[PDB]
Amino acid sequence: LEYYVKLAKELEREGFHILAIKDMAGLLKPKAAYELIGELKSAVDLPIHLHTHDTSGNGLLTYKQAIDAGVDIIDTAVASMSGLTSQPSANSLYYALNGFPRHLRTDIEGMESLS
Amino acid sequence: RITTEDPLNDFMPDTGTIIAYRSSGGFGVRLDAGDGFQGAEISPYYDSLLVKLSTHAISFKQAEEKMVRSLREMRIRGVKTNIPFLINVMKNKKFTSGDYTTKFIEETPELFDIQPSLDRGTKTLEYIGNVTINGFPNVEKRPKPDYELASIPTVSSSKIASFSGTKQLLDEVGPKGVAEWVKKQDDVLLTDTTFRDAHQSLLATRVRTKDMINIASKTADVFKDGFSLEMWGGATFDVAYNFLKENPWERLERLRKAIPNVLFQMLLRASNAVGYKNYPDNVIHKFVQESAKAGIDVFRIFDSLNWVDQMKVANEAVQEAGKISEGTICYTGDILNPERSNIYTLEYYVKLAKELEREGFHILAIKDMAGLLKPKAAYELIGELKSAVDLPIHLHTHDTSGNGLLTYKQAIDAGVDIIDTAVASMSGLTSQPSANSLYYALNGFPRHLRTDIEGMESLSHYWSTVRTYYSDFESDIKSPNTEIYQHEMPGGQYSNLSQQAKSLGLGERFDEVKDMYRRVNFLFGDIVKVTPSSKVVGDMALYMVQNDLDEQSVITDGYKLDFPESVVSFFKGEIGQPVNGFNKDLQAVILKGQEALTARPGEYLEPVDFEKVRELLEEEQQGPVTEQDIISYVLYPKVYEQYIQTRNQYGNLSLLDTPTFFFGMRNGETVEIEIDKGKRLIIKLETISEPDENGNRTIYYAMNGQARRIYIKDEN
Amino acid sequence: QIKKLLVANRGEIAIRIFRAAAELDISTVAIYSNEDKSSLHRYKADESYLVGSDLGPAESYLNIERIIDVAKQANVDAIHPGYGFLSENEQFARRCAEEGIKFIGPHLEHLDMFGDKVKARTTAIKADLPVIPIDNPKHIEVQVIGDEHGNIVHLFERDCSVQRRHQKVVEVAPSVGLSPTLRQRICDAAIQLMENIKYVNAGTVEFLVSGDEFFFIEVNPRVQVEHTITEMVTGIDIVKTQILVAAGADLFGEEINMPQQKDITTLGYAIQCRITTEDPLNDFMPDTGTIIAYRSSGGFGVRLDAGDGFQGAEISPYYDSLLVKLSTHAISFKQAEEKMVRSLREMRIRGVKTNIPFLINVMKNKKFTSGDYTTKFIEETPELFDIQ
C-alpha cells in the first residue's frame, strides 16, 4: 500500500490530471480495493479511475468496494460483452448498487438495449 | 449334448447364426465338435446339437464338478442353448445320488428354474453400434470428439473411512443437534450444488452418474468440512430414468458409499416431492422414507407458491425419518423497492419464517430461484431473520444477474449460516455463485469460507473437461441478464420461452412476450414464480400475446377463448392456493363452470394400494421388485416401464463412459467399458458395412481379442 | 479356507489353474499387461486387473510389490505363481505371506534350498542321492506332492529325453523301455530326498539315467508345463491338489482322496507336445504376427490346454512362444502315438510359422516309438528336419 501511495503522489507531481489503476490481471480483491482506493483519496488530490478484469468473478464485488471508498470513475462493459477476461458488467453493477449510498450514473434500459 | 433346444419353450430347437463360440479344455475334459463354431448358421432341418462335452474322473462327484465347471466355462452366443438345463441337472441332489430314474426330469421341477445370464458383452455392443449408426437423441450425427483426457484425481477410500464430518455428526446428535452445531460456527458453511442444481441449470440436468461417481473420492476430501452435498431432487429423478436410462436410486446408493462423511440433500417439492402430477399423502411418505433409508440426509422442502399448509406432509415424513427438514421461502419481489409490492414485504418473510419454525423445520432455507435477491436486500433480509427466528439460515440463489457473489458476501455480513455453491467451471450465470470466486472474495473480511480452494481448483479443472462431454446440452445464456428484475423469469424459463416463442412464430415479438410475462404475474395477483407455477405464467403470456389479448379483454373475451391447460389447472387450485387469492372474475372465465379445489389436492386423492403395485410389478417382471421400485412406478408410470425395457435391452447403461454413451464409436477406436470391478471389456470397432436388403448393417467389433458380429437396423 | 485365488501368471497356465479353482468354487483373479489386453486368460477369471500400465510386457508379471498391491486391493488370500515368472522367486513368496497371502508352493525354506546348484547338490548329498562327476543320458523326472503335514507321494516319472539343448520338446509318462526296478530306484530316491527336507506342495526331482546308474539334476519347487501327462496316467488333478494342499488339506483326507503309495499306479501312456511359433527351419526362432485361422483337434484321448493361440490377436515376442499344449491318452503306446500324429495334422494354424511339421516327424520316427531314445535324439536325427 505504501508503494502505491508513493507512486500516486509522484504521478500527481508529474502533473497528470487523473490517477488510474490498471488491474490487468484482476488481482485487486474486494477488501484490497477498499483499502487501496481509500488511502489514495486522502493521499492524493487526483480523481481516481479504476479498471479491472472479471477473471476471478469478483469484479463487481471489487467495484462496489472501490465505490465504498470514494473512487470517482470505473471502467465497464455492456452485459453481453462483459465478465471473465472482460470488464465487470455495467448492467449488473447498476442494480447491485441499489440500496447503497452511491448510485451508477447511467441509463439502465438503454444498456439492456445496447446489450 | 449341448444343443439349441430351448428349455424355456418345450425344447423348440432354436436356430440362427452363432456369434461367439468359446470352448472348455483341460484335464479330464473331451469335446466332439458337431455344428457349433465361430460363425455357424444353424439349420432347422438337422438334429440340432452343437457339441458333446463329456468329462471323466476317478470319482463320480469329481466328474460332475468338471462337468459343471465345463458347462459354465463353455460359451455360446447368438442362438439359444440347453446349457443352463444341463448345469441344473449336475447340481441336483437326485442326480448326484446316482439313484435317479427315467422319471427324474418329470419329477424334478427345480431343474426348470433358469435365470437369464444378462449377457453384458453382447448388450454393450448392441448398444454402442446402435448409437454409432442411428445416433443419440438431441445430439448431432457428427463423428466423435472429446480430446482432453483429463485424469481423475482420487483419494484412498481408507483415508475417507476416517474422515468425520456432518454425516457423522447427524448420527451422534440428530437433526436438532446438527442445527445447533451450525449455529455455533463462525465461518460460512457451504452446500455444493455441483451434482444436482449446477448442471440442472447449465446442462439440461444431463449429467450422468459415471462422471459424478468418477470424482466421488475427490469430492469427499474436498468438501470434508462442507455442510451438505446437493445431489438429488429437482429434475434428476425423472431425467435419469428417462433421458439417461439410469436408476437414480443407484446414483444415490453409489455416491453414498463413496462419500460416507458428508450430509446429502435434495430439493423436495411440497406437493409432489419429485413427481409430475398430484399424489395422495402416502406416496409422499413412502418416497421420503426410502430417500432417507438410502442416503439422503437433508430435505429442502419448498412449495411452488409458499403455501405452508402444503408442506406439512413432507415435514411429518422427514421428521419421522429422523432426518433434517428444511423449510424454504421462495423469494420474489424486491424488499428494497416499496413500490414493487405491499404483500411480498420484509414483514411477509419474517412472519413466514416465524411460522415455519413453529412447524418445526430444523433449518430455514431461502430459495431465490430467479436471482432477485439483490445484495442490499439480502443484507437486510437475512439480518432481519436471524433475530426474528432461531433456525440456522440457509441461503440459495442463481448468479443469473451477475450479482450472486455480491448477494452472498452481503448475506455473510448479515450473519448467514449456509450458502449454496458450485465449482468454478460449473457455476455463474443461471448456476449458483462460484465457490472458488467466493473463497478469495472474502479475503480480509471477518468471516471466511470453511472449505479447501486447492482441492476445489482441482474439481473445477475436472468438471471443465467433463463439461465438454455435454456440449450439445449447453444452454443459450452466454451472459448475465438484469431484465430478470422486471419480468422475473426463473433461471431457465426465459430460455424455453424464447425457443417456444420462436416456435409459435413470435421470434421477433419476444419483447412483448416478456412484457406480457410481467403483466400476467399481476393479472394473477402477483404470484411466486417457481416451477410448475412459472410455466403457468409462461403459458398465459405466450397465449395472450398469440391471441392479441389485453389486460381487460382476457375477461371480456374469455367465454370463447379456452385457455391453456396449465392456466386452467392453476385456477382449479391444482397447484395450491396463491398468497393473495384468485380474482373471482378471472377464475370464473377460465374455469367455465369447472369445480375449483378448496384444500390442497392431497386430501382429494385416495391413498395408493402399494401391495397392488407389488402384485402388478412382480407379475410384469420375473420376480424381483423392491420398495424403491414401487414408489418409482407410482411417481412416473410411463417412464419407469420404459426404463425397465431398456434395462432389459442394454443392461446397466450408466456404467458406460459419457462420450461413448452419446456417440458410440469411430472406426478403429478402442474403448474400455467397465461392467463391474474386475470386468472391463476392451472393444475395438474395426469396420461397419453398407446396409443390406433389409437396412441391416453389420458391425465387426473385436472384444477382448475375440471378433464379434452385430446386426443393427438402420432407421435412416 | 481359501476365498479368492489370484494367478500371478498368464496364458495356458492361468487358464489351467482358473479351471481348477472354479471346480473348488473359488473366486478368481487374473493379471495382465497392455499386450495381454487381448489375451484369453483375462476373462477366464471372475476379476482381472491391469498390473500398472507404466510397466512394459516383461515386469508386468515380475514386479513383486505392484502385483501384491493388486492382490491386496482384490482381497486375495492365496496366490498361484504357476511357472516361469515369479514361481521360483523366494522373495516374492516371502513378501507374499507378510501381507496375509498364502503362497501356493513349497515353504520359503525350500525355494532358497533348491535355487542355486551348489545348495541343490548340498541337500541332495545329505539325502543319499547320487551326483555327477557324459553322453547318451536319459532325462527322467519324478513328480511328487506333499501336504503341510509331512505326507508325500510320487506320481511317477516323466521322460523328457526329447530336448534340443534347453526346451523340453516332447514328454512321456510313464517311461517306455525302463524296467520297473531300474526305475523304482529313481522314484524311491526322488521321494528319499523329499522325505528328508519335509517337502510341501508339488515339485519335481530331475534325473539323468545311464543303464542302471543315475544322477540328481535339480528340483523344480513348483508345477511343470509337462504335468499334463502325469495327471492323465494317474487320474489325479495336480493343480487342484496344489490349491487344496495350500489350504491345508490332508492328502489321504476326504478332499483329495489320495491313494497311499502302493494304490497309486499308471494306466496307459500319455504324451504331450507344445505347439509353438518356433520355426523348425530357422534355428527355432519364434514367429510374431497375427493369427488368421485357428482350428483344433478333439475326440478320444485328446486333451487341450489352450493358451495364446486362437483366431485373433497377434503373438508378442515378449513372452514364451507357447500357443497350445496338446496331449493324448490310451492303454497301448502305439495308440497314443497315432493319436498325436493325427491330432497334429488336424491342428491348423495359419498366419505364423509353427513347430508342427517338425513335431509330426518326431512321432512318425520309430526310434522314438522304441522307447530307447535319448537326450541326443534330435542331435543324432537329421531326417527329423524335413522340407515338407
Ligand SMILES: CC(C)(COP(=O)(O)OP(=O)(O)OC[C@H]1O[C@@H](n2cnc3c(N)ncnc32)[C@H](O)[C@@H]1OP(=O)(O)O)[C@@H](O)C(=O)NCCC(=O)NCCS
Ligand atoms: C458371470 C459369468 C460367469 C457368466 O455371466 P453371463 O451373464 O453369461 O456373462 P456376463 O454378462 O456376466 O459377462 C459379460 C461378458 O463379460 C466378459 N467377462 C467375463 N469376465 C471377464 C473378466 N474377468 N474380464 C473381462 N471380461 C470378462 C465375457 O466376455 C462376457 O461375455 P461373453 O459370454 O459373450 O464372452 C461371466 O461374467 C464370465 O464369463 N465370468 C468368467 C468366466 C467363468 O466364470 N467361467 C466359468 C468357470 S471358468
Ligand SMILES: O=CCCCC[C@@H]1SC[C@@H]2NC(=O)N[C@@H]21
Ligand atoms: O436413436 C435411438 C437409438 C437408441 C439409443 C437409445 C438411448 S438410451 C438413452 C437415451 N434415451 C432414450 O430413450 N434413447 C437414448
Ligand SMILES: [Mn+2]
Ligand atoms: Mn485491460
Ligand SMILES: [Mn+2]
Ligand atoms: Mn436452484
